[model samples]
Target: SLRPKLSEEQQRIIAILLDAHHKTYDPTYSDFCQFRPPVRVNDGGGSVTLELSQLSMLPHLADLVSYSIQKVIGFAKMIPGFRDLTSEDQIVLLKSSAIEVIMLRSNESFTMDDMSWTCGNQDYKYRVSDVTKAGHSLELIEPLIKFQVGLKKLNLHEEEHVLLMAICIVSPDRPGVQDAALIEAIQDRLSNTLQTYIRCRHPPPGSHLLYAKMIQKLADLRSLNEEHSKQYRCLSFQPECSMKLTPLVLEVFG
Candidate 1:
């Protein structure tokens, strides 16, 4: 609606972005850290050691999130149509959705046995203990783990995951949006693509609910994000919060 007519060229651009997210697939250790930062700690020797950086820890939490979003932005820039949008509008969308995407991208962190996030490494473990000490509600932890379990059960394909995230990026209504209609045009493209993609693959034996819950989970994620944002406010690293947090995490929660 933002433009007179949607073009095939634009649709192809969208397809490329979706595939770019796909090219960097998971089930591999590196995929785990796509959305969050790596873990780092100082040894008694006074030298700092970093995970994944060391060898195989994997980037699992905040910096990884920044890293992931940065890649998404890079992919977006490849689209002339996307780049046409005002910088302020793009920044608004990025800041608003980066955390949400990061949180969703952390399937690897969601351990079935522990019902907790392990950050693919002990160093950056987002254990309940760590977040709880930051003043988060214990209640918050349960649902997150449950969601991972639910997703693992459904066994979402890699394609579906990327489609879901692409849809999220084109989210029409967000803070600082300069043109809702234009954003909706983009979102319309993604939703249409996802609808067709889902139909083609079809669900597994008992996984009809997978299709429904994937949509459902997006809503749940928004609610979860709101709750986490509350905890973030409490940390209030800047003007109001009681704690001192750094960019690695502050980017997500701050």
Candidate 2:
């Protein structure tokens, strides 16, 4: 949301982003591989020797969101001004925040319980405790679910969604940033655009607080995505021999 009005091209870019990001080879995430049901291994303990569909379990855990990241990157390329940046800066931005975009896009999958998250069948949810970050899944389960709950409650619009991701991707302080000023300018444009959009169009009628809340939600998302990315790195190194995320995903959050 901003003082100046949006130009015809800016509005067009926003629409294009919404369309591109939403379209993808979307799929129901199963354990281990895309459509394969995760196997239950036995280490002679007579119980499921659960580790990973691959190894860390987080990859399976992150199936949908990781795919969403791919789609969102496709969307990013459609942004009118985003493509012209130095390739280094573009890589840095994407690697830093692609997960955050996925988290936003995946809000619908969160369940009332931290232990479970489902795509469509809220009745058929998966266990969050089934996976671990740094060997302890319990720590992240509650807070992650809680955050997802609040995020879903926000009922964000498509434009708001794209802009927030643009904000996430436009970080100036992302590691190895060679063009801080340009990135800062990009983020400022996104911030102002979002602020204005909310002020003018926040739903539920006259609730200005929604905008503030959405922006605040970013802190939670940024923290969560960063931690999850860390988990990917550590868990990928486990002895179980895991699968890999998209090469771009590895660059951003692996």
Candidate 3:
């Protein structure tokens, strides 16, 4: 497989763009809105005027706009590499990466919400506004890891572990936010998410012990990472954002 190699600058730009898109298009608060003009006017003139605005009347539009700009920057970063590759190759990368990005964003949002409500209390309330900021950081890191792992040409089974570890290592641990009770709540939710993952990915007849082991390992890592926040600072933020719904150029593959 002839994979494209992005320059260091290009890679940096891509990170910046991904960060931006994650921030802007987060769906946690239903900020995506469209404007439709009236079909007909009462006056003789048949023309109709319509005005479009932010999805939320609240003051989050600025943040959304900022995210959009990051998306544009990402697109710009892709242009040169995109042009260098054959149209088919370009399409292949775009399609494969796009859906993954969307999936990543959705997971990020889910994790963030789980952490906010389950991990912390009133002082650490998980507001919709904070979703983008909290989630995007994790989103930005995972894709780079995926890209790196893929480039290494790991076996499919190993690749699966790589992906799982990428997510688990980046996720928050039992003590959610700054509250002990919240942390306990989050631990319960973490158990549930792990069960869901096993059910969905492994199905019946799969090794429950193996799945449980992975979850336990992740929990342990979470604790370790919490104590070493400065070393793993990026993992502290929630991985989910509102842009999970926005259709990007990528497609999902089974």
Query: Going through the candidates in order, what is the number of backbone clashes in each?
Result: 11, 8, 14
TM-scores for all candidates?
A: 0.68, 0.76, 0.25
Q: How accurate locally is residue 41 in candidate 1, as Cα lDDT from 0 to 100?
A: 41
Off by over 4 Å in 3: 1-31, 35-80, 112-254
lDDT of 1 by residue, 44-158 (tens): 2322122112312122333454456666666455533456567877777767776677667777556777666664566545655444433345566667666668766767676
Which one wins by lDDT: 1 or 2?
A: 2
Using TM-score as the measure, name the better of candidate 2 and candidate 3: 2
- What is the C-alpha local distance difference test score of each model? 0.57, 0.62, 0.33
Give per-residue lDDT, candidate 3, residue 80: 24
Weakest ten-residue segment in model 3 by summed lDDT: 46-55
Best by TM-score: 2
RMSD of 2: 4.5
Q: Which candidate model has the greater lDDT, 1 or 3? A: 1
lDDT (tens digit, per residue) of candidate 3 on 154-215: 22232234234223312222222223343344334334433443444443344345555554
Tens-digit lDDT track of model 2 for 1-254: 34456666556756776676556424354322452233223323222234433343344444545556667777666655678788878877777777777766666555565535675453235555344421334445566777877876677886887777777777787788998998888777678777766766665554457767877888887778766766666655666433534444455554
Question: What 10-residue stretch in candidate 2 is worst by lDDT?
Answer: 39-48
Task: Indicate the residue-level lDDT of 9 in model 1.
Answer: 56
Better of 1 and 3 by TM-score: 1
For candidate 1, give the lDDT of residue 230.
76
**Over 4 Å off in model 1, which ranges?**
1-19, 22-65, 68-72, 75-81, 118-121, 124-126, 206-210, 237-244, 247-254
